[PDB]
Structures are given as C-alpha cells and as structure tokens.
Design a binder for this molecule. Structure first.
Ligand SMILES: C[C@]1(Cc2cn(-c3ccccc3)nn2)NC(=O)C[C@@H]1O
Ligand SMILES: [Zn+2]
Ligand SMILES: [Zn+2]
Length: 197
C-alpha cells in the first residue's frame, strides 16, 4: 500500500552554482525555431526532446530548478536527441552540456523515473500530454524524467542563463507564467514520496 517511489531531496544550500560561457540557442527566433523543425522533420522525422526535472528543498519546501534565459522564458534542462540516440544517455549528455563543470570532473546523473510525455501535432506552439485526434505524424515528442541529485554537486550555469529554484506553489495553475508542461509539474510530482534530507 506503499506504492510510491521514494526520492531523496537535499537543501538548495547543498549545491554550488558556478558560471561558464554563454550557451546560445540553435534558433534566434520562434520563426527560425519552427523553420528548422520543418526542415529536420523532412530529413529525419519527428523531433525527440528530453527534459530533466531536478528537485531540491529549502526548509522541507520542494523546488524545481528552472533555467531562465536572461529574464525572458523558463525552461527545463534538456534538449534534442540525435537520431538513434538513447533517451536516458541523451538527457545525461544534454544536462552535462548545460550544467556540467568547467573543471571537467565527471558528474553523476541518476535517472530512474519517467514523469510524462508531451506531443506537438504541428509546427506550432501547442503541446499535449497525448497524441491529439486525427494526428498520425506528430512533429515533436517530448519526454520528461525525474533526475535524482546527489547530496552535493557543483553546477556551472551558462552566463546568459539564471538557475532559479521555483517552489511548487508558484508553478501550480500558472500556465501563462510557465506554460502547460512546467505548470503541471506539481501534479506530476505529487506521486513521489520525497525525503527532506
Ligand atoms: C511550451 C511552450 C508554451 C505552450 C503553449 N501551449 C499551448 C497548448 C495548447 C493550446 C495553446 C497553447 N503549449 N505549450 N510551447 C512552445 O513552443 C515554447 C513554449 O515554452
Ligand atoms: Zn529548515
Ligand atoms: Zn511519440
């Protein structure tokens, strides 16, 4: 009757947030983003993205780590898989590219839980937690995973990003602020048995 996954959380003060060089988006605009998605869909088919949910606490209040591009949009650490690339190896690679240390010490990502799937039916912003009716060729499949952090770690945050710890209450029913994936993380995380270390 204990059917919940147990996840260790550590205080945000256990983590060091260093800095490194800016990491630029492949796309300079929404228009270029959907143009490249169109181009790549014709060459290699559906885009496969992976995103990591990294959780900490302060004073037993869980917080999700988000990347803020300057003071603009909020994203999860993650990105695009290469064709034939394993989802979990790919998320580990992407989280190393974004948050990995300037001193090149190997970081230990633990990924054991899928927490959701989102599908983009068109070359347009809307994403859904299912393949919508009549859609046979979704343009993007996004996979979210829970990343179990170590007790302590040093992260290097690209100088053009801020790493922000968002409490769940701030995400909850805040799609305008965070969009439909990040704003549904409180619901998606509720099944876990968090231990506040
Ligand atoms: C994740 C977002 C925002 C967003 C809005 N919608 C949505 C869903 C249903 C109906 C109308 C809008 N889905 N995702 N999509 C992007 O392309 C980047 C941005 O972060
Ligand atoms: Zn406390
Ligand atoms: Zn799919």
């Amino acid at each position: 009757s204990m059917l919940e996954r147990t996840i260790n959380l550590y205080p945000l003060t256990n983590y060091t947030f260093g800095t490194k060089e800016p990491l630029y988006e492949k796309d300079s605009s929404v228009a270029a983003r959907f143009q490249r998605m169109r181009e790549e869909f014709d060459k290699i088919g559906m885009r496969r993205t992976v995103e990591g949910v990294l959780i900490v606490h302060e004073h037993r209040l869980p917080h999700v780590l988000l990347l803020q591009l300057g003071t603009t949009f909020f994203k999860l650490p993650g990105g695009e898989l290469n064709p034939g690339e394993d989802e979990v190896e790919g998320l580990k690679r992407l989280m190393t590219e974004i948050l990995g240390r300037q001193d090149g010490v190997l970081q230990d990502w633990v990924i054991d839980d899928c927490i959701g799937n989102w599908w983009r039916p068109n070359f347009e912003p809307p994403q859904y937690p299912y393949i919508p009716a009549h859609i046979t060729k979704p343009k993007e499949h996004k996979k979210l995973f829970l990343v179990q952090l170590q007790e302590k770690a040093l992260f290097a945050v690209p100088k053009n990003y801020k790493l922000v710890a968002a409490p769940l209450f701030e995400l909850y029913d805040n799609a305008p602020g965070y969009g439909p994936i990040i704003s549904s993380l409180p619901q998606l995380l509720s099944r876990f048995n968090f231990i506040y270390n």
